[model samples]
Target: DIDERNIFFELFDRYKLDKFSTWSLQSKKIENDPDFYKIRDDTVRESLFEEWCGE
Candidate 1:
């Protein structure tokens, strides 16, 4: 379960990066602006606890 959670967590990190990239690209196209935002920093941090580890 720990291994699975680690894998899923990594994927979540990847997804956050991918999502931010998409949003940055879109914003740049629309207004010549670029910004990056993280979706769930607190959740990601708390996920280090076993209860919120995955999904």
Candidate 2:
């Protein structure tokens, strides 16, 4: 099975370094969506939950 916690920690580490902030912000422009904040928030939350549940 995949180590979801490790996966999420990797992502969290990257985000902690602000690696995806720029990309995420740019995606909002291309998608013409102003809800990047919420999208990213939910993504982080879901990923954390998935990792926690080992799902």
Candidate 3:
């Protein structure tokens, strides 16, 4: 779970999105990508997003 969170962090960096970015916006960045879909739980994904912003 911890390592999975890092996946979101990496995506944010790859897409040039800051901590201020919303899940709605961030999700779109990877919407068409199959790789990112591996971590497809929205709840888990959002938690990491908040975690990243809190960091």
Candidate 4:
């Protein structure tokens, strides 16, 4: 795997996703879901993390 950006595959794997396209909808779900935002900046399941700082 590469260390570049747009890591949708990693994103998919981190969530135990089956299809690559699943990340698309999940990506949307993550944007406005109240519960999702609560843990947005934290590590995922104490394993894989997909976070970044805007500042």
Candidate 5:
């Protein structure tokens, strides 16, 4: 189904999509995806940003 494939697509690729690309704190597929897990994971990104401001 289109809906399921959308959920399983690349994070950056889906971000441009107008439909079936919903994301939030509750979403988990992005975190599990082998391709862009780091980009999709919030905890890693936020922690890195904190250090970025100090540098």
Candidate 6:
């Protein structure tokens, strides 16, 4: 299995997520994607999501 961090980063890059958007808003775009489910933890997903968006 791919590392969750790797998976999250892949999504971030693949989707070219908006840094200005809220986590929920940015995440909604990828929620239905198959790879989105590769993340094993919501907390982990949210944490990395915030970090990427804030970066």
Candidate 1: segments with Cα more than 4 A from true spot: 17-55
RMSD of each: 11.1, 9.3, 1.8, 10.2, 12.1, 3.1
Please, what are the lDDT tens digits per residue for candidate 2 over residues 5-49?
345434444444233345334333422433323344544534443
TM-score of each: 0.28, 0.27, 0.70, 0.28, 0.29, 0.68
Q: lDDT tens digits, residues 1-55, model 3?
A: 5987877767766775655757758767665766357587867766766777765
Candidate 4, number of clashes: 0
Best by lDDT: 3
Predicted structure 5: lDDT? 0.36
Instruction: Name the candidate, 4 or 5, with the larger lDDT value.
Output: 4
Choose 1 or 6, whichever is better by lDDT: 6
**What tens digits encode model 4's per-residue C-alpha lDDT throughout 1-55?**
2232224334434544434343435555443535344444434411222332110
Report backbone clashes per prediction.
0, 0, 0, 0, 0, 0
TM-score of candidate 1 versus the correct structure, residues matched by position: 0.28
lDDT of 1: 0.33
Clashing pairs in 4: none
Candidate ranking under TM-score, highest first, comes to: 3, 6, 5, 1, 4, 2
Leading candidate by TM-score: 3
lDDT of 2 at 44: 55
